[PDB]
């Protein structure tokens with residue numbers, strides 16, 4: 001019942017690409033919201049913000065079309081993880097990455113096209129998705 | 143107390159039926175019996191936030207799948223196949239579910255992009271789990 | 279407020295695969311419990327329960343086929359052919375219930391020839407696992 005059992009710590013989001021065109025050196029703005037109940041992901045910037053310190057899982061899946069895709073998962077101010085998928089004609093591809101990262105309050109995580117942004121073949125339409133998900137797995141205790 | 147609801151399953155026949163769930167029948171985990179291998183459908187028994195992740199070996203034909211919730215397509219994954227180039231396609235998402243909601247995968251559309259593949263040494267899998275039970 | 283934690287997330291660096299041997303991922307994204315052993319490439323269950331495993335491989339120069347092993351048996355197979363001038367991305371994930379003593383790791387399939395895994399300063403191939411639900415009595 002209300003307030004009855006162990007308290008549940010939640011911080012999670014799952015978002016998809018719509019019409020946004022990637023911009024060099026900027027976070028990828030995923031604006032389709034599968035889940036963002038804590039408002040910890042900001043679709044106006046593409047960044048997730050940690051409000052509960054702990055261990056987080058992040059996972060992304062990209063439909064690769066027209067151009068190569070190369071993305072970087074950033075934490076705070078640093079690229080942590082890289083995923084490259086080359087595109088050849090008539091061969092849509094699927095690229096993914098996932099990792100665990102420990103985060104402190106205020107740390108931000110986001111996805112960006114790698115380098116100066118050329119390998120930006122991320123794709124979505126009414127029946128194709130490119131997604132980015134993150135969630136708190138273990139809150140810190142002390 | 144631990145709230146558990148999870149399953150992880152694999153394909154053992156890769157022949158699909160248009161407009162029907164992909165029936166993953168190999169059981170990696172299904173301890174709560176919340177996934178029904180006779181239909182290919184997960185049944186929500188605990189309201190909350192769920193993570194779903196699938197991985198498909200793409201062979202012989204293009205693959206296009208849709209993750210369904212309550213007979214609505216929620217998520218799409220397309221991977222074209224070129225000869226002599228087996229591929230790997232995957233998708234994952236968080237969905238909030240209420241008790242009674244059902245989730246499954248289907249080949250997209252009229253079912254023609256059905257190049258999913260599994261055999262004795264190749265897998266295509268579908269996994270889901272409760273992450274946070276709902277509370278007030 | 280106690281949380282049962284057992285998790286790791288690791289990436290390939292300069293290690294070169296060898297037939298019939300675990301793949302030794304040495305870039306540590308997380309390994310706070312030391313339940314993954316970088317000296318051998320193996321995760322060891324230290325808390326009986328349900329675990330999620332997920333891996334992502336950059337496929338370059340040669341076909342990739344990997345097997346996820348649990349207690350010396352291959353559980354799960356992921357194959358991705360490499361065509362010239364077409365780097366690919368291969369992934370797999372599964373839930374496995376583990377008991378004390380169970381080890382989990384990745385190997386190249388079969389005799390080890392489909393070993394096109396790739397990593398460098400701006401490409402990754404990763405392996406992650408975590409305890410989702412500890413067993414209770």
Ligand SMILES: [Ca+2]
Nearest residue numbers: 092093222229
């Ligand atoms: Ca493809």
Ligand SMILES: [Ca+2]
Nearest residue numbers: 228229359366
């Ligand atoms: Ca391929």
Ligand SMILES: [Ca+2]
Nearest residue numbers: 086093365366
């Ligand atoms: Ca490719």
Ligand code: NA
Nearest residue numbers: 094230367368
């Ligand atoms: Na792929």
